[PDB]
Enzyme design. Structure first.
Site, PDB file in Angstrom:
ATOM      1  N   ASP A 230      -4.907  -7.521  -0.317  1.00  0.00           N
ATOM      2  CA  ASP A 230      -4.875  -9.002   0.403  1.00  0.00           C
ATOM      3  C   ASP A 230      -6.185  -9.857   0.678  1.00  0.00           C
ATOM      4  O   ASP A 230      -7.190  -8.989   0.711  1.00  0.00           O
ATOM      5  CB  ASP A 230      -4.148  -8.726   1.872  1.00  0.00           C
ATOM      6  CG  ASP A 230      -2.838  -9.025   1.683  1.00  0.00           C
ATOM      7  OD1 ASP A 230      -2.166  -9.763   0.943  1.00  0.00           O
ATOM      8  OD2 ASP A 230      -2.209  -8.349   2.600  1.00  0.00           O
ATOM      9  N   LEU A 271      -1.871  -2.911   3.039  1.00  0.00           N
ATOM     10  CA  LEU A 271      -2.239  -3.322   4.321  1.00  0.00           C
ATOM     11  C   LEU A 271      -1.689  -4.965   4.347  1.00  0.00           C
ATOM     12  O   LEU A 271      -1.216  -5.477   3.484  1.00  0.00           O
ATOM     13  CB  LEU A 271      -3.582  -3.524   4.312  1.00  0.00           C
ATOM     14  CG  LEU A 271      -4.533  -4.170   3.043  1.00  0.00           C
ATOM     15  CD1 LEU A 271      -4.620  -5.559   3.019  1.00  0.00           C
ATOM     16  CD2 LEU A 271      -5.979  -3.437   2.930  1.00  0.00           C
ATOM     17  N   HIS A 272      -1.929  -5.559   5.610  1.00  0.00           N
ATOM     18  CA  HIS A 272      -1.377  -6.884   5.676  1.00  0.00           C
ATOM     19  C   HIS A 272      -2.182  -7.511   7.091  1.00  0.00           C
ATOM     20  O   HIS A 272      -2.265  -6.664   8.010  1.00  0.00           O
ATOM     21  CB  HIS A 272       0.003  -6.994   5.880  1.00  0.00           C
ATOM     22  CG  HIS A 272       0.784  -8.310   5.492  1.00  0.00           C
ATOM     23  ND1 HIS A 272       0.568  -8.585   4.190  1.00  0.00           N
ATOM     24  CD2 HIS A 272       1.272  -9.192   6.106  1.00  0.00           C
ATOM     25  CE1 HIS A 272       1.412  -9.890   4.146  1.00  0.00           C
ATOM     26  NE2 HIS A 272       1.764 -10.153   5.292  1.00  0.00           N
ATOM     27  N   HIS A 285      -0.080   7.107   3.129  1.00  0.00           N
ATOM     28  CA  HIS A 285       0.776   8.331   2.900  1.00  0.00           C
ATOM     29  C   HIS A 285       0.574   9.801   3.342  1.00  0.00           C
ATOM     30  O   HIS A 285       0.965  10.614   2.960  1.00  0.00           O
ATOM     31  CB  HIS A 285       0.885   8.418   1.373  1.00  0.00           C
ATOM     32  CG  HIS A 285       1.507   7.000   0.806  1.00  0.00           C
ATOM     33  ND1 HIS A 285       1.832   6.778  -0.265  1.00  0.00           N
ATOM     34  CD2 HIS A 285       2.426   6.248   1.636  1.00  0.00           C
ATOM     35  CE1 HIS A 285       2.434   5.427  -0.627  1.00  0.00           C
ATOM     36  NE2 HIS A 285       2.866   5.169   0.589  1.00  0.00           N
TER      37      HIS A 285
HETATM   38 CA   LIG Z   1      -0.173  -7.513   2.388  1.00  0.00          CA
END
Ligand SMILES: [Ca+2]
Length: 312
Positions: A230, A271-272, A285
């Site tokens: 991102d 991710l975000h 993980h």
């Molecule tokens: Ca994302």
């Protein structure tokens, strides 16, 4: 390469294959558990996480004609609060907050059987760019392009076409769209996991990409490589480097990372950013869990944060 070690705070745990973190229009948080199985068969889940307690709720456990899905990546829509979910067995799904869902395509615009998808990214024009590292969707036997180059890229357009825009990738995974300051989409970035490469294309229009180039290089010789990614608000690209214990930060021009972010685990998967904040939620993980940490600035607004009816 400079490395920072920000504090990672635990968000939730025990999410098999945790990935696809996403926020919807109301600020609610969701993730996918692609590796949940029942009797050795796919039974992947889409969950909502209450950020106040870390408690999890399975809102959707997709299956089409008995074939369980492997939900792997998400994007929130803009005009309706619904999630577009890349599924390694079912292709592309549109999931409602109430848990109901619909399968978008069994075949693409050329009549070819659809491939299983991993992640996706909406551009500001509403077109959805999707990576498809799996072979044909169910009922076809499950296959993955980790060894052979049969991974593809699609663009699901505003007028409802599922167009294959490229092929022959060795496990395309993370994907992101770079926009001009005025909002025009102009560059597509695609992670090819095992080859340790980030590929770029010039976006000339809806489902129109050209000038394919090896844009960036992922550090390490470890098993794995670039997964989810991102952009932050300055267009720096943050990329989970699965197996390296780091999230790489690429400047606007790519090449080698300009900075690295050390994670307290070896396998970041995606991710975000949380809207209107510098907070990045990271799925991983190693512990099949979700964490969050503070980045240097806010994230680049996702399509769901833009306004269809604004003036500026
Ligand atoms: Ca994302």
């Amino acid at each position: 390469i400079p490395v920072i070690e920000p504090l990672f705070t635990k968000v939730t745990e025990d999410i098999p294959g945790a990935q696809g973190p996403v926020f919807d229009k109301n600020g609610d948080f969701y993730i996918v558990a692609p590796e949940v199985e029942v009797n050795g068969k796919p039974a992947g889940e889409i969950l909502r996480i209450d950020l106040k307690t870390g408690k999890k709720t399975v809102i959707c456990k997709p299956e089409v004609n008995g074939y369980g899905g492997i939900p792997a990546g998400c994007q929130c829509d803009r005009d309706a609060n619904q999630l577009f979910v890349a599924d390694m067995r079912l292709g592309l799904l549109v999931v409602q907050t109430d848990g109901t869902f619909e399968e978008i395509a069994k075949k693409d615009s050329e009549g070819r059987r659809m491939q299983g998808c991993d992640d996706c990214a909406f551009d500001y024009e509403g077109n959805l760019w999707i990576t498809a590292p799996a072979g044909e969707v169910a009922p076809a036997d499950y296959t993955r392009s980790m060894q052979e180059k049969f991974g593809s890229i699609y663009c699901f357009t505003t007028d409802g076409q599922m167009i294959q825009v490229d092929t022959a990738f060795q496990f395309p995974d993370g994907i992101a769209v770079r926009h001009m300051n005025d909002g025009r989409p102009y560059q597509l970035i695609v992670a090819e996991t095992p080859t340790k490469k980030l590929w770029s294309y010039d976006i000339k229009g809806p489902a129109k990409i050209e000038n394919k180039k090896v844009w960036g290089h992922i550090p390490g010789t470890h098993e794995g490589g670039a997964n989810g990614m991102d952009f932050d608000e300055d267009n720096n690209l943050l990329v989970a480097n699965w197996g390296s214990s780091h999230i790489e930060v690429f400047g606007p021009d790519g090449g080698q990372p300009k900075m690295r972010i050390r994670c307290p685990f070896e396998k970041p998967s995606n991710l975000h950013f949380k809207p209107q904040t510098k907070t990045i939620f990271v799925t991983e993980h190693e512990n099949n869990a979700v964490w969050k940490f503070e980045w240097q600035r806010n994230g680049k607004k996702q399509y769901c944060e833009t306004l269809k009816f604004g003036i500026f």
